[PDB]
Design an enzyme around this catalytic site. Structure first.
Site, PDB file in Angstrom:
ATOM      1  N   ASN A  54      16.968 -48.389 -21.754  1.00 10.39           N
ATOM      2  CA  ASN A  54      16.274 -47.180 -21.326  1.00 10.39           C
ATOM      3  C   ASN A  54      17.120 -45.947 -21.635  1.00 10.39           C
ATOM      4  OD1 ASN A  54      14.717 -49.272 -20.249  1.00 10.39           O
ATOM      5  ND2 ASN A  54      14.066 -48.021 -18.503  1.00 10.39           N
ATOM      6  N   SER A  87      23.706 -53.592 -19.215  1.00 16.26           N
ATOM      7  CA  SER A  87      24.375 -53.485 -17.924  1.00 16.26           C
ATOM      8  C   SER A  87      25.370 -54.615 -17.708  1.00 16.26           C
ATOM      9  CB  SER A  87      23.341 -53.479 -16.801  1.00 16.26           C
ATOM     10  OG  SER A  87      22.354 -52.491 -17.033  1.00 16.26           O
ATOM     11  N   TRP A  88      25.089 -55.797 -18.253  1.00 17.49           N
ATOM     12  CA  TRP A  88      25.931 -56.955 -17.982  1.00 17.49           C
ATOM     13  C   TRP A  88      27.370 -56.726 -18.424  1.00 17.49           C
ATOM     14  CZ3 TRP A  88      26.101 -61.565 -15.581  1.00 17.49           C
ATOM     15  CH2 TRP A  88      27.053 -62.489 -16.010  1.00 17.49           C
ATOM     16  N   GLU A  89      27.589 -55.837 -19.386  1.00 19.16           N
ATOM     17  CA  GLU A  89      28.902 -55.641 -19.983  1.00 19.16           C
ATOM     18  C   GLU A  89      29.650 -54.437 -19.430  1.00 19.16           C
ATOM     19  OE1 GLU A  89      26.152 -55.708 -22.686  1.00 19.16           O
ATOM     20  OE2 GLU A  89      26.108 -57.804 -22.040  1.00 19.16           O
ATOM     21  N   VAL A 111      21.551 -47.938 -15.636  1.00 21.85           N
ATOM     22  CA  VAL A 111      20.229 -48.029 -15.031  1.00 21.85           C
ATOM     23  C   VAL A 111      19.838 -49.497 -14.957  1.00 21.85           C
ATOM     24  CG1 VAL A 111      19.107 -47.679 -17.265  1.00 21.85           C
ATOM     25  CG2 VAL A 111      17.824 -47.313 -15.155  1.00 21.85           C
ATOM     26  N   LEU A 112      19.119 -49.853 -13.895  1.00 23.28           N
ATOM     27  CA  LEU A 112      18.749 -51.232 -13.623  1.00 23.28           C
ATOM     28  C   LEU A 112      17.244 -51.339 -13.424  1.00 23.28           C
ATOM     29  CD1 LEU A 112      21.594 -52.302 -11.169  1.00 23.28           C
ATOM     30  CD2 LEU A 112      21.372 -52.899 -13.580  1.00 23.28           C
ATOM     31  N   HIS A 119      13.272 -63.209  -5.030  1.00 26.54           N
ATOM     32  CA  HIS A 119      14.008 -63.092  -3.774  1.00 26.54           C
ATOM     33  C   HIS A 119      15.284 -62.282  -3.959  1.00 26.54           C
ATOM     34  CE1 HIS A 119      11.370 -66.124  -1.909  1.00 26.54           C
ATOM     35  NE2 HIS A 119      11.436 -66.741  -3.073  1.00 26.54           N
ATOM     36  N   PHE A 144      30.286 -45.196  -9.321  1.00 26.67           N
ATOM     37  CA  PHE A 144      29.088 -45.989  -9.583  1.00 26.67           C
ATOM     38  C   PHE A 144      27.916 -45.036  -9.780  1.00 26.67           C
ATOM     39  CE2 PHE A 144      25.866 -49.282  -8.471  1.00 26.67           C
ATOM     40  CZ  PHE A 144      26.242 -50.206  -9.420  1.00 26.67           C
TER      41      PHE A 144
END
Lengths: 149, 160, 160, 149, 149, 149, 149
Positions: A54, A87-89, A111-112, A119, A144
Site C-alpha cells: 500500500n 511488514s514481515w521484514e 501499514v497493516l 481469531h 512504532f
C-alpha cells in the site's frame, strides 16, 4: 503535520536527546534531579525503515517524517532510508541500522491489513513484538509508526 | 499426457514465487549495508537489487497437503533460475509437519555458505475457537531465529 | 527539501515499470528461439528469463504532460538497473508530441545494437465522440514496425 | 503564434535536428546518452503542402509557417510550396516532395469540415492514415497541421 | 471439449491437412475437383502461443488444446509452447514460430478485457489485425482462440 | 505557445542578443549595416518578476516563460524569480533586479483588473509608466507581460 | 480585516523582508533562485503618513494598520505616525520620512472625496504619481492604500 508520520518523528527527537543527558556527568544534588528531553534536532543521526505494501498511504507518512526532522534543524545529510518488501521484514531490517554506531534513533513506518476476521493475526504480532525486544537489547530508541487499516 | 497438463500451469504469482522474490532482495540489501558507504551531501537511500547470481539459498518444506506444497516449491525454484540463479546452489530439505519447520530452518541458517532461507508450509483450519498452539509457534519461532542469526528468513505459508 | 520528497516516491508498479519488465522477457525469449534446440521426447516449453545483463535498450518519450511522463521514465530506468542492467547501455530520445513517437521508434529499432524499445506517452481525453485519429495512429504504427523488423516494441501509454 | 501553423513549424524543425544527431557518430559514452532536438534552423530545407478549401483561413496559417522558419535562422530560398485542390490530395502530393534528397521535413496544412454525420468522414480518416504511413516508409518526419472546424 | 480451446484446435488440424493436398499433384479430371480437410493429426507439427493475463481462464483453454491434438493421434513430442507477458505480444511472438519450416500450424490462445466503456478499444484491435495479415504473408494457418470477458 | 508568457520570453531573448551585437566592435563596412537579434539563448541570464493576485492565472504564464528559455538553449541555473504582493510593487522590485551586473533582461508578468470605472485606473498607469522609465535610465530591456481581464 | 488599511500594512510587511534577502548573500546555486518574503514583522521599523480631511474614515483605516504590526510580532514602539493637512501634502511628507536611515518602510492613507468631479483629476493624479517616483529614486518600498470616494 497531524499524520502518524509526524507523531513518530517527534518521539524520536525527544528520546534521542534524553539518552544524551543521562550518560553525562551527574549534578551536585541538593534537589530532585528531573530529566527531560528537548526538541532540538541539531547534530543527530536518524534512520527510517519503510515498506512498500500500500505504497500510496506509506508514501505520505514518510514525507511527514522527513519534514518534521528538517523543520527542527535536521540536516538532510543525516537521514538514511531503507526500504523492505513488506511488514514481515521490518524488525530484521531495523536490526542492522541500530547496530551502527552512527545512528541515534530508528523510526519504523508501515501499514497493516485490517483483518479482524480470524481469531488472531499471527503475522501482525511479530512486527510489534520484534521491535520492542530489539530496543531493550541494543539500548536505543525505536519508534512504532505503523498505521492500521 | 497428464505430465503435460501439470507443466502447462503458470508459476508466476503463487505464494512460493513471492517468498523467493522477497528473499533475493533482502539478501542483496544486506550485502550493501555491511560493505562500503557513500560520499554524502544528500539523503542516502538503500534498496536491494533483484539479481540472484552468486547467491546460495535453502528451502524447507513440509509434507501435509503435499499436492499443494509441491507446486509452491516449484514456484520458488523457478524464480531463482529465471532471475539468473544457478541450480547447483539450492538445498532442499523436507520435513514431516509444520510443528518442526523452525528446527530445520535453524540448521540451514547457521551454515556460513547460505544467504537466505525460504520456508513453505500449509496451515489447516485457521478459523477455530481453540487456539492453534502449533500455528503460533511456527510464526514466532522463525522470527526469533532471523534476529539472532542476522540473516533473512522468508515465511510463505498458505492458510487452509 | 522538495528533492527528497520526489525521491521518496515508489517506482515499482507504475506503467513504466511494467513496460520495461515486458521488454526484458521478450528480448531474452527471442535469443532462445533463434539459437539452438532441445533433444526431444517431451513437450518443449519456451519462456523468457528476467535477466537484463548484456542487453541494450532504447526509450522514446513525449513531452506533453511532462510531469507525469518523467516519472514513468524513471520507473523504466529503475527496472533495468535493478535487474542487472548497465546504465551505459540505455539510449533516451525525447519527442514533442504523441503523433510522432512511431517515426522515432523506427530509427532506434533499425540499429543492429538494440534489442527492445520501450515507448512512453500520455493520451488526453480518450472519451470523446470524435474519433481521435492521432490516438489510433500511434497504436497502429508501433505494431506494424514490430512485425516488419522482427524486434519487440513495448507500448506503455497511460490514458487521461 | 497561437495558430496551428506556428506549432507545426516548431515540431518539424526540431525533428530535423534530432535525426541529424542520431545517424551521426556516437559520443564518448560511459553514461546514458540522451538525444534532443535543437531549434536552430540553419541549413534545413523544408517543404509545405497546403490545400485551398476555405482559402481565407489556410492563407494565414502558411504565413505563420514561413515566418517561424525565417525567425529561427532559416534561409527563405530553401522552402518549396505546393498547392492542391483539396484535402484528399494531400497524401499523394506530400509523398512526391518527400522522396527528394534535398528535403529534410514536410508540413501538411489543411482544413476539414465538421463530421456531423453519423458515419465518420472517410476522407478525414484517409489523410491521417496516409501521412502517417508515409513517414515510416520513407523515414522522414511529416508534421500534421490539419485544423478542424 | 466444448471450451473455445477445443474449437481452435479442431480448425488447426483440418487446415493443416488441407494445405498438404493442394500442393500435391493434380488429378486426371473429368469431374469437379472437390478439396476438403481431414481430422487425422498424425505426422503434423504444432505450436501454441499463450499469455498470462488472467491465467486462471487461460490455463484451462491450453489444457483443451493439448487434449484435442493428442486424442486425434497427435504425438506429444510435436508440440512447442511459447508464453508471452500479455496480449500485446501475441502477434510478434507468433511471427517467429510461423517462419520455422518445421511448424505446420499455429494456435493463438488468449483473453481480452471486457471494456466496452470507451468508444473503441485500440489495443484489442491490433492483435486481431496483426494475426490475420501474418497468415497471408507467410502462407500458413493461424487460429484465433481469444476469448472475451 | 499562445499565452502571453511565451511571447514575453521571445522578445527578451532577442533584445539581449541585439544589445550584445551593438556594443561590440563594428564590421568591415562598405555597405549598409543591419542589426538583428538571434533567438539563441546561450549564456543569457534572465530575471522574472511575478505578482500573486489571481495566482491561478499567473501560475501558468510563468511556466511558459521558463519553458521558452530552456528550449532555446537556456541553462536553468541562470534564472532568478521574484514574487510580489500585487501589481503596484512590480516597478520597485524590477529595478532591484535590473541593477545587478549578472542580468541581461527582465520579464514582468502580472494581471490587471477591468477598468470599468469612468476614471482610468491610476495603479494601471503607474506600472506601465514605471517599467518604461526604468528601461531608459539603466539601459536594459524590460519586457511587458501584463495581461488584462 | 476587511478595510484597505489592513491590506496596505500586510503588503508592506512582505516587501520589507524581501529586500533584506535580495541584498544579502545568494543561495547555494544549481537551481532556480526563487525569492519570496514572509510575514515576520519583528525587527522592522515602519512609518505611516495619514491625512486629516474626513478624519472619520481615515481614523479607522489607520487603526487597522496598527493591528497588523502588533499582531504579526512587531513592536508598538517602532511605529511613527505623521499627520498632514490634506492629500496634497502626502508626497513631500513621505519623502522626509522615507529618507530617514532607520525607517525601512512607509505607508500612506487618505481619502480622495472630490474625485467624483473631473476638476479634481489634477490633484488626484499627482498624489499617486508622486509616490511612485519616490520609491524608485530612494530604492525603498512605499505602499499606497488610499480609498476613492
Amino acid at each position: 503535520h497531524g499524520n502518524k508520520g509526524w507523531e513518530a518523528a517527534l518521539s524520536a527527537i525527544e528520546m534521542a536527546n534524553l539518552f544524551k543527558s543521562l550518560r553525562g556527568t551527574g549534578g551536585s544534588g541538593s534537589s530532585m534531579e528531573i530529566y527531560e528531553g528537548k526538541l532540538t534536532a541539531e547534530g543527530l543521526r536518524f534512520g527510517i525503515v519503510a515498506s512498500r505494501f500500500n505504497h500510496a498511504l506509506v508514501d505520505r507518512l514518510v514525507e511527514g517524517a522527513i519534514d518534521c526532522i528538517v523543520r527542527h534543524g535536521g540536516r538532510e545529510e543525516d537521514i538514511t532510508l531503507v526500504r523492505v518488501p513488506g511488514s514481515w521484514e521490518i524488525p530484521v531490517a531495523a536490526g542492522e541500522l541500530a547496530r551502527k554506531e552512527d545512528i541515534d534513533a530508528v523510526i519504523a513506518i508501515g501499514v497493516l491489513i485490517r483483518g479482524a476476521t480470524p481469531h488472531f493475526d499471527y503475522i501482525a504480532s511479530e512486527v510489534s513484538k520484534g521491535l520492542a525486544n530489539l530496543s531493550l537489547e541494543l539500548r536505543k530508541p525505536i519508534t512504532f509508526g505503523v498505521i492500521t487499516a
